[PDB]
Design a protein around this ligand. Structure first.
Ligand SMILES: *[C@@H]1O[C@H](CO)[C@@H](O[C@@H]2O[C@H](CO)[C@@H](O[C@@H]3O[C@H](CO)[C@@H](O)[C@H](O)[C@@H]3O)[C@H](O)[C@H]2NC(C)=O)[C@H](O)[C@H]1NC(C)=O
Ligand SMILES: *[C@@H]1O[C@H](CO)[C@@H](O[C@@H]2O[C@H](CO)[C@@H](O[C@@H]3O[C@H](CO)[C@@H](O)[C@H](O)[C@@H]3O)[C@H](O)[C@H]2NC(C)=O)[C@H](O)[C@H]1NC(C)=O
Ligand SMILES: *[C@@H]1O[C@H](CO)[C@@H](O[C@@H]2O[C@H](CO)[C@@H](O[C@@H]3O[C@H](CO)[C@@H](O)[C@H](O)[C@@H]3O)[C@H](O)[C@H]2NC(C)=O)[C@H](O)[C@H]1NC(C)=O
Ligand SMILES: [Ca+2]
Ligand SMILES: [Ca+2]
Lengths: 395, 396
C-alpha cells in the first residue's frame, strides 16, 4: 500500500511560470478545452518560434560575413547528430511504453466494471425466475398446509428484498462507455505520434549520412538542395521542441493534482463518495456498500435455511414436488457464489491499483520521454546548425 | 480484458537453439537453476564466446602481421559504429533494468497481500478468544432463573468454536512470504550491480574512443599506443559481455516457456497443489476451494447476531447493567463481520493472478529484449574496436 507522490521532474516543471499573451498571469490548474488555459500553452510555441527565428538570423549573419568577406566541425556535427538520435530513440520508446501502460490499465478497469454490471443483472434475472418458480410450486402442490404457504410467501418477500438491495448498487454504463473511447483515442494518437517521430529520426539520419558520403565527391549539385533541406530539418526540430514542451507542461499540470481533476470530471453518473473511496483506499474509509452486501448475505442465508427446513419436512409428503424445490436450492447456491465474486470487485484494492498503474504510466514515463525528446530536439538543432555553418566554407 | 500468458516470438525462437553440454552431449534439460548439469550446459555458450574471441584475435593478428611485416574513412566508420553501439547498449540496459523493477513491485504486492491475509486470520482468532472470555465473565452475572439464556450462551460458545476451527482451516503464508522477500532482495542486489557494471563499461568505451581520437589528432603520442594496447582489453570485455548476455538469455527463456509448471514444482509441500493451481490458473471455471469455508464461516456470524439480537430484546428489564458488555459483543461481531469481507477480497484469484502476470511480463518481455539489445551492443562494439585496432598502426 503506497500513495502517489509527484517526483522532482513533475513539481519542478510545474513550477515553470505560466503566461498568456499580454504578460498576463494565469492559474496553473489543469483545465482542458478552455480558453484562458489552452491559449496559455501557445506561449511555449511562441517562444520556440522566436528561438527558431533568432537562430536563422544568426545563421544568415554568418552567411553574409562568410560571403561578402574544417573537418573538426564536421566530426562534431556528426557526433552530436548521433547522440541526438540515440537520446530521441530512448525518449520515444519510453513515452510509447507509458501510453501502452495507460491503455492496459484502462482496459482492466473497463473489464472490472463490465463484470460488476453483468453480475448485478444476472442476479436480478435469477431472482426474477425464482419468483416464477415459487409461483409454479405453490400453484397447486401445497393446499392444506397453511404454514408451507406462509413460508413460501415469506421467501417471495425475501426475494423482493434481495431485488431491491441489488437495485441499490450503482450502474457503470457511462464510465465504461467513456473509458473505451478514451482508450481508443489515446491508442490512435500514440500510434501517429510514434510513427511521426520515427520518420523524423530516419530522415535526420539519412540526411546526415548522405552529407558525410557526398562531401567526399567535391561539392556536386546535391550540396545546394541538401543545404536547403538543412533548414526544413531545423524548423522541424524546433516545432518538435515546441510540441514536447507543451505536452510536458500539460502532463505536469494533470499530474500535480490528478485526483481533484478526476473527481471533478465525474460527479453525475457515479456518486462522489464512491469516487473518493476508490481514489483513496485505506483502513479508515471502510465501504459505502457494506450494509448492502451484509443484508444481501443475510437474506440469502435465511432463504437457504428455509429451503433446507422445507426439504427436511416434505420428503414423504408430495414426493413429486422436490423436482422444483431442489432447483431453487441450486439457484440460491449460484447466487451465493456470485455474491463472493461481487465482494471481490466492490473492494477498492484492485481498482485503486489499476488507477495507480495508469497514473504511473502517465506521470513517470510520458514526461521522461517528452523531456528526452526535447533534449533530442536541442542536440539535433545544434548539430544541424554546425553543419550549415561548416557547409558553405567549401564553396 | 482478462488474458492468459503466451510466449512471444523472441522466446519460442530463442528456446529452440540447441543445448549441448560441454562435450557435444544431449543435455535435454528443461529448467534447473541448482543442478550442476544445467550449469555446465549453459557453459557451452561461454565456450562458444571464448572460441569466437580467440578466432577474432587470431584473424586480426594474422592480418596485422601480413600487412606490417609483408585513410580517415576507417576511423570515421569505427567512430560511427562505436556511437551506434553505445546508443543501442544504453537502450538495452535501460530496458532490462525496467523489468527487474516490475518484478520487485509484483513480489512486494504479493507479499503484502499474504501478510494481510495472515494478520486478518490471527486477529479474528484473537477476537474469538476475547469473545469467549467475555462470555465467561458474563455467565457469572446473570442467573439461570430463566434457563433459555444459558442455552443461548452455550450455543454462542459452540458457534465461536466452529468459527475458530473454520479460521484454522485456512492456510498459512509464512514460508511463502519469507521466500518471496529473500528473492526480491537478491534480485534487487544483482540487478543493481549488473546495471552499474555495464554503465561503467559504456563510459569506459566512450572515454577510450574519444581520447584515442584526440591523441590521433596529437600526432601519435604515447597515448595512442596506450589506446591500441587497451583495444584488446575492451575487445575481450565486449566478448565476455556477449557471453554473459547469451548465457542469461538462453537460461531465462526456458523458464518463460512453462513458468507455471516450474513454480508449481518448486512449491508443493508448504501449500496445497490446488491452491497454487487456482492462483496460477483461474481462467473461467474454478470453484475457489476456500468458498466452502467462507460460506459456513459467514453463516455462523449471522446466527450469532440473531441470538444476541434476541438477547437485547428480552433482557432489558433483567439486570440492565449487564447489557453493557453485551453491546460490546455486537461490536465484536461487527468488526469480525467487516474483516470477513476483506478476507473474501484477498482470497480471490484475480487479486494475485494479475501480480503473477506482471512479474512474468517483467521477465519474459523486458529482460529478454534488453539482453538481446545488449548482445547487439557487444557485437557492434567488438566490430568497431576491431576496425579501430586494424586502422591504428597504419599511422606508424
Ligand atoms: C469495454 O467495455 C465495453 C462495454 O461497456 C465493451 O464493449 C462491448 O461489450 C459487450 C459486452 O461483452 C460486447 O458484446 C459481446 O459481443 C460478442 C460478439 O460476438 C458476443 O459474442 C458476446 O457474447 C458479447 O455480447 C461488445 O462486443 C463490446 N463492443 C465492442 C465494440 O467490442 C468493450 O469490449 C470493452 N473493452 C474495450 C477495449 O472497450
Ligand atoms: C514481506 O512481508 C513481511 C511481512 O509483512 C515483511 O516482514 C516484516 O517487515 C517489517 C518491516 O519491513 C518488520 O517490522 C520491523 O521489525 C523490526 C524488529 O524485528 C523493527 O525494529 C522495525 O522497526 C520494524 O518494525 C517485521 O518485523 C517483518 N516481519 C518478519 C516476520 O520478518 C517484509 O519486510 C516484507 N518484505 C519486503 C521486501 O518489504
Ligand atoms: C453493529 O452493526 C449494526 C448494524 O450494522 C448496528 O446497528 C445499527 O446501529 C445504528 C447506529 O448505532 C442504529 O441506527 C438507528 O436506526 C434506527 C432505526 O432502526 C433509527 O431510528 C435511529 O435513529 C438510528 O439511526 C441502529 O442501532 C442500527 N441501525 C441499523 C440500520 O441496523 C450496531 O449499532 C453495531 N454495533 C455497535 C456496537 O455499534
Ligand atoms: Ca521503461
Ligand atoms: Ca520499456
Amino acid at each position: 500500500r503506497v500513495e502517489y507522490i509527484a517526483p522532482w521532474w513533475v513539481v519542478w516543471l510545474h513550477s515553470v511560470p505560466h503566461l498568456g499573451l499580454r504578460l498576463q498571469r494565469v492559474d496553473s490548474t489543469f483545465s482542458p478545452g478552455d480558453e484562458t488555459y489552452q491559449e496559455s500553452l501557445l506561449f511555449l510555441g511562441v517562444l520556440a518560434a522566436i528561438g527558431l527565428g533568432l537562430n536563422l538570423i544568426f545563421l544568415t549573419v554568418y552567411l553574409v560575413c562568410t560571403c561578402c568577406c574544417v573537418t573538426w566541425t564536421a566530426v562534431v556535427a556528426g557526433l552530436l547528430c548521433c547522440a541526438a538520435v540515440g537520446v530521441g530513440f530512448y525518449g520515444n520508446s519510453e513515452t510509447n511504453d507509458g501510453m501502452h501502460q495507460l491503455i492496459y490499465s484502462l482496459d482492466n478497469a473497463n473489464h472490472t466494471f463490465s463484470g460488476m454490471d453483468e453480475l448485478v443483472s444476472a442476479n436480478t434475472q435469477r431472482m426474477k425466475v425464482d419468483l416464477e418458480q415459487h409461483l409454479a410450486r405453490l400453484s397447486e402442490i401445497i393446499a392444506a398446509r397453511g404454514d408451507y404457504i406462509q413460508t413460501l410467501k415469506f421467501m417471495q418477500q425475501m426475494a423482493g428484498n434481495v431485488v431491491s438491495q441489488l437495485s441499490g448498487l450503482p450502474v457503470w454504463r457511462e464510465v465504461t462507455t467513456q473509458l473505451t473511447k478514451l482508450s481508443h483515442q489515446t491508442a490512435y494518437v500514440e500510434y501517429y505520434r510514434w510513427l511521426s517521430y520515427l520518420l523524423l529520426f530516419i530522415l535526420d539520419l539519412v540526411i546526415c549520412l548522405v552529407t558525410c558520403l557526398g562531401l567526399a565527391r567535391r561539392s556536386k549539385c546535391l550540396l545546394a538542395s541538401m543545404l536547403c533541406c538543412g533548414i526544413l530539418t531545423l524548423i522541424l526540430s524546433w516545432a518538435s521542441l515546441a510540441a514536447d514542451a507543451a505536452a510536458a507542461v500539460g502532463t505536469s499540470d494533470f499530474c500535480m493534482a490528478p485526483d481533484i481533476y478526476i473527481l471533478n470530471n465525474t460527479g453525475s453518473q457515479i456518486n462522489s463518495e464512491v469516487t473518493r473511496y476508490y481514489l483513496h483506499c485505506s483502513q479508515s474509509l471502510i465501504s459505502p456498500f457494506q450494509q448492502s452486501l451484509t443484508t444481501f448475505q443475510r437474506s440469502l442465508t435465511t432463504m437457504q435455511i428455509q429451503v433446507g427446513g422445507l426439504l427436511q419436512f416434505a420428503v414423504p409428503l408430495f414426493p413429486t414436488a422436490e423436482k422444483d424445490l431442489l432447483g431453487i436450492q441450486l439457484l440460491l447456491n449460484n447466487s451465493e457464489i456470485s455474491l463472493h465474486q461481487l465482494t471481490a470487485m466492490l473492494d477498492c484494492r484492485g481498482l485503486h491499483k489499476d488507477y495507480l498503474d495508469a497514473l504511473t504510466g502517465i506521470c513517470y514515463d510520458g514526461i521522461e520521454g517528452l523531456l528526452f525528446l526535447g533534449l533530442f530536439s536541442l542536440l539535433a538543432a545544434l548539430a544541424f546548425s554546425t553543419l550549415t555553418c561548416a557547409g558553405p566554407r567549401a564553396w
